[PDB]
RNA sequence: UCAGUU
């Protein structure tokens, strides 16, 4: 558990572990309590065009995300899913490769 | 379905 760019301000959160059929309205309905949401990115598969397994929630502000990204498992729709800072697939490669320990 | 075609 590194917290992807914890010192960095983020404006989109990653929703994983969604075993229940969760969509845009579900996520927004929960995360709106934290702050102003921009869009809910239900990231479909770029091959078949299906619910690939994960989604993102874009916020208009990077403070609204802070109350969220600090906690991992959030209960949305009634299911307790995993929420973390949504780092780009570009960044997630570099950040994972440069995973440092002391 | 736990990452935006890593």
From Swiss-Prot:
The modification Dimethylated arginine is found at residue 100. It comes from Homo sapiens (Human). Identified in the spliceosome C complex. Identified in a IGF2BP1-dependent mRNP granule complex containing untranslated mRNAs. Interacts with SEPT6. Interacts with C9orf72. Interacts with KHDRBS1. Interacts with UBQLN2. Interacts with PPIA/CYPA. Interacts (via the RGG-box) with the HOXB-AS3 peptide; the interaction inhibits binding of HNRNPA1 to the intronic sequences flanking exon 9 of the PKM gene, preventing inclusion of exon 9 and promoting inclusion of exon 10 which suppresses formation of the PKM M2 isoform and promotes production of the M1 isoform. Residues 1-91 are annotated as: Globular B domain. The modification Phosphoserine is found at residue 98. The modification Asymmetric dimethylarginine is found at residue 100. It comes from the Eukaryota. It is found in: Nucleus; Cytoplasm. Involved in the packaging of pre-mRNA into hnRNP particles, transport of poly(A) mRNA from the nucleus to the cytoplasm and modulation of splice site selection. Plays a role in the splicing of pyruvate kinase PKM by binding repressively to sequences flanking PKM exon 9, inhibiting exon 9 inclusion and resulting in exon 10 inclusion and production of the PKM M2 isoform. Binds to the IRES and thereby inhibits the translation of the apoptosis protease activating factor APAF1. May bind to specific miRNA hairpins. There is a cross-link at residue 19 (Glycyl lysine isopeptide (Lys-Gly) (interchain with G-Cter in SUMO)). Residues 11-90 form the RRM domain. This is Heterogeneous nuclear ribonucleoprotein A1. Sumoylated. The modification Omega-N-methylarginine is found at residue 100. Transmembrane segments: none annotated. It is linked to Inclusion body myopathy with early-onset Paget disease with or without frontotemporal dementia 3: An autosomal dominant disease characterized by disabling muscle weakness clinically resembling to limb girdle muscular dystrophy, osteolytic bone lesions consistent with Paget disease, and premature frontotemporal dementia. Clinical features show incomplete penetrance. The chain holds residues 95 to 196 of 372 of the full protein. There is a cross-link at residues 85, 89 (Glycyl lysine isopeptide (Lys-Gly) (interchain with G-Cter in SUMO2)).
